[PDB]
Write a protein that binds this ligand. Structure first.
Ligand SMILES: Nc1ncnc2c1ncn2[C@@H]1O[C@H](COP(=O)(O)OP(=O)(O)OP(=O)(O)O)[C@@H](O)[C@H]1O
Ligand SMILES: [Mg+2]
Ligand SMILES: [Mg+2]
Length: 350
């Protein structure tokens, strides 16, 4: 800890992060406004039934936090436990949304039971007097299925867009934070590997710095035992290596997460993705939709924050296009480069 530095950094920039979080809610403000009124049509405090206990809970809106591709996540206060929670609400664009959410619920909580570094939901609730999972009234269709979980301080996607939106002088502290986040990402991916696990989206919208400064991975339903076959489409296309883009069914391998780790470290230092891949929310991004389509396939560091050579080497080995020759995170931790990374950090923190 390490973690402590990041905890303190996040606290000191709480106001800048809040500003950028508010800024990111403007393009999708239509969506946000409609969903808020669906869940809190009256006065900010809604009673819901738990789908796990048929206990009740009383949830007060504090503020919207983030919009996703298929959801809005709010900060809420459980007024009987005096604790804040993130609450994720799902939109129902997909024709089979209701069945998809019932499966997601069953899968998520069966996996969470088994387990008890992963950010897990602790409850799922539904507005009273309307059936669970069905479109929630008063109707941007929203499902009557609201997922309660610990609130992250920031997801990495927001951290990157915060770094991109406002130039802020951070001096040596900022550079140290880039080293620490790099080390934290490598240690989290190595923890997956040591357990023979692979996550389908080790991606910045699912990597979270919690209030204690620790990095966590969300969405347990997208964990796989290594070597398992599953739908390639479950990997976001800009974070998929070519071996995933080329099949309907793919094998979930450690090489996937080495690739995804390489992309996130590249974003820590560069904010946009490499290889010209489209990176919404970041100014420097090019517009290539995936590695399926031709483009520039060499690594470019010219527009990044200046990177240590040992970081460039690590990124380059994680992003080897040959899945057989791609460096894995546990082996990365035994390389001279990772040792230089650790020692840079240790000597700056002393
Ligand atoms: N527990 C949480 N605390 C804080 N922010 C969260 C939490 N869970 C999710 N978020 C953020 O909310 C946004 C939307 O969530 P997420 O990206 O998981 O959903 P999505 O985009 O709708 O679905 P998917 O990512 O699986 O396609 C993201 O910025 C994410 O990091
Ligand atoms: Mg997302
Ligand atoms: Mg998610």
């Amino acid at each position: 800890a390490g973690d402590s530095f990041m905890r303190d950094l996040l606290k000191r920039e709480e106001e800048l992060i809040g500003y950028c979080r508010e800024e990111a809610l403007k393009e999708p403000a239509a969506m946000v406004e409609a969903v808020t009124a669906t869940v809190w049509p009256q006065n900010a405090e809604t009673t819901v039934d738990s789908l796990l206990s048929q206990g009740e809970r009383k949830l007060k809106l504090v503020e919207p936090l983030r919009v996703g591709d298929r959801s809005v996540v709010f900060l809420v206060r459980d007024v009987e436990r005096l604790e804040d929670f993130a609450l994720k609400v799902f939109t129902m664009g997909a024709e089979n949304s209701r069945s998809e959410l019932e499966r997601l619920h069953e899968a998520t909580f069966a996996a969470a039971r088994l387990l008890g570094r992963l950010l897990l939901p602790s409850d799922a609730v539904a507005v009273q007097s309307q059936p669970p999972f069905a479109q929630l009234s008063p109707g941007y269709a929203v499902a009557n299925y609201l997922l309660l979980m610990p609130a992250a301080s920031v997801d990495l996607e927001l951290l990157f867009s915060t770094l991109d939106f406002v130039y802020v002088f951070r001096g040596d502290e900022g550079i140290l934070a880039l080293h620490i986040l790099t080390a934290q990402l490598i240690r989290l991916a190595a923890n997956l590997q040591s357990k023979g696990l692979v996550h389908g989206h080790f991606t910045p919208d699912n990597l979270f710095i919690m209030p204690d400064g620790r990095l966590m991975l969300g969405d347990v339903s997208a964990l796989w035992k290594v070597g398992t076959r599953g739908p390639a489409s479950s990997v976001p296309v800009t974070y998929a290596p070519r071996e995933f883009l080329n099949a309907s069914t793919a094998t979930f391998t450690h090489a996937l997460n080495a690739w995804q780790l390489g992309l996130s470290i590249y974003r820590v230092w560069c904010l946009f993705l490499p290889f010209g891949l489209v990176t919404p929310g970041i100014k420097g991004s090019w517009k290539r939709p995936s590695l399926r389509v031709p483009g520039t396939d060499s690594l470019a560091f010219g527009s990044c924050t200046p990177l240590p050579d040992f970081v460039k080497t690590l990124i380059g080995r994680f992003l080897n296009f040959d899945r057989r020759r791609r460096l894995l995170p546990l082996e990365a931790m035994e390389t001279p480069e990772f040792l230089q990374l650790q020692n840079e950090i240790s000597s700056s923190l002393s």
